[model samples]
Target: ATFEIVNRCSYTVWAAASKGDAALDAGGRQLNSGESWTINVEPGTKGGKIWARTDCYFDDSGSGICKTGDCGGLLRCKRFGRPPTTLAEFSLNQYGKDYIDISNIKGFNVPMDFSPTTRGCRGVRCAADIVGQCPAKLKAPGGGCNDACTVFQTSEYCCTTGKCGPTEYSRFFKRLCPDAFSYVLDKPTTVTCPGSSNYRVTFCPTA
Candidate 1:
């Protein structure tokens, strides 16, 4: 399958991707305000993600921290980054199905749209002004919104044990992005599709 990682934000964004602990053979790229980078993924790739980093300053060797989504401070990430970042995740060609979503589980910085460009598939997006309206307690530094789990880390929001349910915080997120998997035990907001679909991961997408 193909992924078009587009930066539609007003400012530049550093685009990154990772498949669990594996690296992107093509590596991450700097997508200027209107630029995009397209790449192909092999079948049966799981735990894959595409996210953007903001307010980044990398050196000539691609090493620096981003205000959001800085993966080990490497321009070419070898693992998933630390949050407050929006996510476009994919679990493709698994058991004859393709699963995808725009996840705020790690937190939220940029608005996102994760959708297929072809038929036989639906899409999920989270483009609300979450950073601007982030709850005071769940707000992160650098203009990002932190998840309740990340903020409080209690059994209630973190699901520390084997059980949990919705709370005021999770509901607030659900109201913002109805299709997102708002919390750990949130209902399945993951979209299922065929394996042949191509996708678009738009950063700071329009409503």
Candidate 2:
């Protein structure tokens, strides 16, 4: 019998690895939009699991951590198998900002889409395109000023001593602006099933 595979991400994913992991590597091909690939597997190949992966983007500097506002943290997965069970899943806090490879298991199908939001901040100012300042009237904890203050408020809030540096304030605009972190996953970097070699398959996302 033949099984179908789908790719559903905002970006293209290389499937050469999945082919190698699935054992039978014949007739594997690239799956375009709305397209599916058929794979021939011998009888008794009752697939009990599915796997998928994608690449995520993030910042490298340690100036600040990823906040919910930056779409900086996320990890969501659900299984729709006959008995339906939650497979591999996780959502990390203060995930270091940088490019990363993410993966998950499935009660679903291949070609799954995965996109994560990331946050980044560099220690110094002037390196950033936007700038901000803190309010002078409001005292900072320990009498120190808050960084990136200007970006959140209007010019009235600008205070040299308590003001936000250019880079610190710009994040406010980046977070408020539409589509700042919109993204999609097109393919998997790798997908490996465990235990029995035989595998059962199903279509996901209704095509």
> Highest TM-score, which number?
1
RMSD of 1: 1.3
Predicted candidate 1 versus true structure: per-residue lDDT over 14-92, tens digit per residue: 8888896876545477899889899887778898998898888899999988888888988987788778878888888
TM-score against truth, every candidate: 0.96, 0.24
Candidate 2's displacement at residue 158, Å, is 52
The true-structure Cα RMSD of candidate 2 reads 20.3
At residue 93, give the lDDT of candidate 1. 83
Q: Model 2 residue 138 lDDT?
A: 25
Error of 1 at 42 (Å): 1.7
lDDT of 2: 0.25
Give the CA lDDT, 0 to 100, for residue 145 in model 1: 91
- Clashing residue pair totals per candidate (backbone < 3 A): 0, 25
Show where candidate 2 strays beyond 4 Å: 15-22, 46-50, 53-207
After superposing candidate 1, which stretches have Cα over 4 Å from the reference?
none
Per-residue lDDT of candidate 2, residues 9-111 (tens digit): 3333212112212433341233344454545544333221223222322334311211111111212112211111111111122132121122211111122
